[PDB]
Structure 1
Amino acid sequence: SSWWTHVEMGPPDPILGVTEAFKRDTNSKKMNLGVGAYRDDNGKPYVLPSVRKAEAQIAAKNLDKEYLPIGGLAEFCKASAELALGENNEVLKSGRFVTVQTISGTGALRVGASFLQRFFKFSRDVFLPKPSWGNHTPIFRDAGMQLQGYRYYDPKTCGFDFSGALEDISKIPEQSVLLLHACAHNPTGVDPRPEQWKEIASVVKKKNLFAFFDMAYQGFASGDGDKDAWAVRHFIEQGINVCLCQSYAKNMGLYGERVGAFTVVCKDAEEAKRVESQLKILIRPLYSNPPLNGARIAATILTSPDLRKQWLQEVKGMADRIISMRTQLVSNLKKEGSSHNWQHITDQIGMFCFTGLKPEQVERLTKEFSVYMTKDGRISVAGVTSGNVGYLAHAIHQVTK
């Protein structure tokens, strides 16, 4: 007597649970360290002025709203590949890549997954770091791939378990897919060092693996676009034919406009044309064609030397404000008398920090102090202000003294 009587209610959203638990809390000193987007020194959302200026120029052009090609705005695709690999990359010069516009980084992930499902005949397995972005798991499963793990986060140190990572990678059957965060690993903030990368690169090429890069933070991570894109470029120069998911949600503040690109580096231009045609064939039955607004903004910024330069410094200020909060947190933890090693909070990169806090300590931070955060010890460094970091260092010490 109904189509949907057996449809069950989903598990609740832990990250949304906390974000609502915070709005309810009435104490004026409450912090939300669960928020998944950049906030300014006052905890407000931040629309980059280069973005505002791009919108101004765009509006002036009085443009139409006609469909994009299936692969999106050609000029955004070219600029985006350029941002990822550097303008004079051997790959761009010979044309041996295809880049399609996607529905932010998630859509690039899903389009990427769907492409492996269909054309990566060698294996069903996708190896994620332990842990990874939560959504990585259902994206690859819903798309029809098998998930696996390799060691990454060393809880003992709150940094990279280089050696476990490496043993694990050497043991991946050949021609399996390996997923890598290009920088600012999410949720932990723990990234390999350049020398560590070269070694993963070595095994990957040795053991004949497929390197799938997720790059959500180029520039936002360290302030330096080239540094943040270094591992990806290094794999390519090593002769590894990567694919790559870019997001402009964070580094341009374009979250809700859903601006992303998926790229596949190929042996040659003719191969890229074959791959391109099949990405179009997968994309059409997902959503036909991608949205105009974000991509017009990002294209306008990237292809204007002035605006590009200005945006690039606006990114540095975001990256910096975050770094500042990391350094200032450790500072005030010392200044408060704490004894344990907090260098991991500043060794980590990007806006997510695995603190080391265990769950009970997390719960006491919520109860006694109104500091909201996931039981895994992850905080949004974007929730920290200069105005509140002091209080936070006090509170963290209390549950940990």
Structure 2
Amino acid sequence: SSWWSHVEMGPPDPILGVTEAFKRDTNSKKMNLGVGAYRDDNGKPYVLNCVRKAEAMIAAKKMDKEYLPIAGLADFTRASAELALGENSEAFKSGRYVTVQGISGTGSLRVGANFLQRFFKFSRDVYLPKPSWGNHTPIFRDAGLQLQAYRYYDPKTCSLDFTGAMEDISKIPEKSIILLHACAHNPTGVDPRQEQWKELASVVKKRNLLAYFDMAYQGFASGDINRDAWALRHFIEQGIDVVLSQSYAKNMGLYGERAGAFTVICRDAEEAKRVESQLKILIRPMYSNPPMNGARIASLILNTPELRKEWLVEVKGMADRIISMRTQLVSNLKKEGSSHNWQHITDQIGMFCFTGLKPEQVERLTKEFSIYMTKDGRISVAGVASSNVGYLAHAIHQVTK
């Protein structure tokens, strides 16, 4: 034996560390701002009603558990493309796109990364925003690509470094790959405004870059599925053939069921079929065929008028609670007599927020108030409730005054 004597202990995960330290707390006033999933007003996981209805429908039909085609459930992939591109999209209607079911957003990004490693002969470089979701790195690196970065978040104003971004992208070598978060940037919450997006499209177009969109929060960010997909749809309409990863983790609350899709925009239907064949050849030896449950659920909801309708109400409800907590946090901090500028908290979008707090403050926050978050000043707004937002604002004031 002794095959593994040299395998060393891997680095501990921080996020993991806060949660655990959180559990190990007695203060009934403790807050976990490191939670990576949506939580209702009571701090409880939320299974959507439309989701429970879908499950009841599936159960009633006594469906089989036979393997899905390599590319997944057809009703799912098509519905997925339609949600993303829009019903009257030319890309959709002409069938010049190919969508394959992936294991949620992450599996989709990986299949996508592996596809580029294999067929994107023009470059090996993937440009990520500074900063980006932690997983983005190992995803591409493990896939065999080289990581690069473009300026994005401005720590001075806790907002978008629009000028740095524009300057960086303008200098990116032609035919390089650039990853863009479609909405609700993770981890900052900083997104470009419609007008800045128009401008990015143009440079991306001019530099002839391959735009890789990561769309994990459609509908969940603003409560509007069309508005959340505006940027993606704009690029395509501008003639930029992007590639895209979708997740239904947050927007349908399908977390553990793992429903997602990877999409490639092609020149035509014929090209789309060649691409599809190669995507299937790549996935087979990865995991053979995808998990059916989440896809069956998502497909029902998307394809059933009544359920789809209930879904939009529920997603909006989620988006709204988030926006509400953002609004209430700022109002409360003001009322506390805090003199700092906290408008970034409300200018931010989605579940994650870069507060600007410093490490020593985060620490004070953790030590004296039982408020757990990562040292980067990033908080999950999902961890804030109507009942604790007050306590949170209070604490933040104390540590920052």
Residues 144-196 of structure 1, C-alpha deviation per residue, up to 9 Å, x if partnerless?
Answer: 00000000000001111101000000010000000000000001000000000
Q: 1:60 deviation in Å?
A: 0.7
Q: Distance in 1 between matches of 2:96 and 2:362?
A: 49
Letter in 2 for 1:28: S
Q: Which residue is 2:281 aligned to?
A: 281
Is 1:316 equivalent to 2:316 in the alignment? yes
Is 1:370 equivalent to 2:382 in the alignment? no
Corresponding residue SS for 1:387: coil
Corresponding residue SS for 2:208: coil
RMSD of Structure 2 on Structure 1 (CA): 0.5
Q: 1:12 deviation in Å?
A: 0.3
Corresponding residue SS for 1:126: strand
Letter in 2 for 1:397: H
User: How many residues were matched structurally?
Assistant: 401
Is 1:111 equivalent to 2:111 in the alignment? yes
Q: Which residue is 1:270 aligned to?
A: 270
Q: 1:61 deviation in Å?
A: 0.9
- Map 1:131-210 to 2 at 5 A: 131-210=131-210
Q: Distance in 2 between matches of 1:278 and 1:172?
A: 28
Q: Distance in 2 between matches of 1:130 and 1:281?
A: 33
Residues 297-341 of structure 1, C-alpha deviation per residue, up to 9 Å, x if partnerless?
Answer: 000000011110100110000000000000000000001000011
Q: 1:102 deviation in Å?
A: 0.4
Q: Distance in 2 between matches of 1:309 and 1:190?
A: 29
Is 1:247 equivalent to 2:268 in the alignment? no
Q: Which residue is 1:70 aligned to?
A: 70
Q: Distance in 2 between matches of 1:92 and 1:34?
A: 38
Q: Which runs of 5+ in 1 are unaligned?
A: none
Q: Which residue is 2:343 aligned to?
A: 343
Corresponding residue SS for 2:388: helix
Q: Which residue is 1:99 aligned to?
A: 99
Is 1:327 equivalent to 2:341 in the alignment? no
Q: 1:85 deviation in Å?
A: 1.0
The ranges of structure 1 where at least 4 consecutive aligned residues each deviate by more than 2 angstroms after the TM superposition are none
- Identity across matched positions, percent: 87
Corresponding residue SS for 2:37: coil
Q: Distance in 2 between matches of 1:178 and 1:165?
A: 12
Q: Distance in 2 between matches of 1:113 and 1:249?
A: 20
Q: Which runs of 5+ in 2 are unaligned?
A: none
Q: TM-score, normalised by structure 2?
A: 1.00
Q: 1:375 deviation in Å?
A: 0.3
Residues 58-105 of structure 1, C-alpha deviation per residue, up to 9 Å, x if partnerless?
Answer: 111110000000000000000000000111110111000000000000
Letter in 1 for 2:187: P
- Map 1:385-396 to 2 at 5 A: 385-396=385-396
Corresponding residue SS for 2:165: helix
Letter in 2 for 1:193: R
Q: Which residue is 2:3 aligned to?
A: 3
Corresponding residue SS for 1:363: helix
Q: Distance in 1 between matches of 2:358 and 2:31?
A: 18
Letter in 2 for 1:240: I
